[PDB]
Amino acid sequence: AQNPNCNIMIFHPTKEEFNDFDKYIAYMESQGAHRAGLAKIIPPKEWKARETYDNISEILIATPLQQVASGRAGVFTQYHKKKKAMTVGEYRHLANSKKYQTPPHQNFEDLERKYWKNRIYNSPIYGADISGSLFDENTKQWNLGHLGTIQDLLEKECGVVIEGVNTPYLYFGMWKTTFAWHTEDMDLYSINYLHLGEPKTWYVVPPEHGQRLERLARELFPGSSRGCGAFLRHKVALISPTVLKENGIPFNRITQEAGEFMVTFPYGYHAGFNHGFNCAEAINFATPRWIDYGKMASQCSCGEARVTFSMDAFVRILQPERYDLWKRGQD
């Protein structure tokens, strides 16, 4: 079995190898990459996402989210308070202000220490989940707005024809902006490109051990667990590496820098934080190997997780027994 310790793998495709996206994903899995839950892909030196970022300040962040924490430094939840709209130029200036800017630090490890010590005492503002793309239309390789759609994958593998669409999302971050522990909708893959700015640190649990994380989360957030049998779908809970290690949960960590892709694999729980002002683009995708994960994915029906239009068909076709209850949660 390849990668039996479930380490995060880093890939350096050549420009030739960068042509066929599906083929390269399957290659990485042949080497055991999926066992980690997360892989890094460094693009060939000849590739670029777009010519310059010199013109992005006019993008609007219609609903910036202030991420307010509750709990203790290593075990907390965050709620999102909606803020007034602002442009990316306005948001960048805010990120760089004395109140929000990255503190002085020695290296990524020192910054990580500072994040886990102090995160809860601040409320950074995240421009998350903005439909759109920063890839040039002329970028033909690994262009996250030109991928094969999940609906087309389901049609090719299973024969069924369904409504729905599959588009990318932009994320504008600042110091301490946080993504809570989660798997993707329907335990899909994700791919994330860091277009510019400061790094993003990731934590990940191997898919084969995801239920260990779920059991810890039920212990650590016991009221949330009674409320919902899949409350990690709410995307609000944080658990630090120190707490994970104290509880014997297998995990790995890695830092993504501008110009790099990360892939999350089906049922790979992940969480992390931004180092400073940055912009990422991400989208969900599927392969043949996903279908069995989609059939088994948990679902929130309590009403909190509320998701896209396109998830309806996935539940309806892959999980017809659950459909009625899950749709009550949506309505």
Ligand SMILES: O=C(O)CNC(=O)C(=O)O
């Ligand atoms: O970058 C972020 O805030 C969160 N991204 C992801 O969870 C992802 O790409 O799957």
Ligand SMILES: [Mg+2]
């Ligand atoms: Mg602009």
Ligand code: NI
């Ligand atoms: Ni994700």
Ligand SMILES: [Zn+2]
């Ligand atoms: Zn729920």
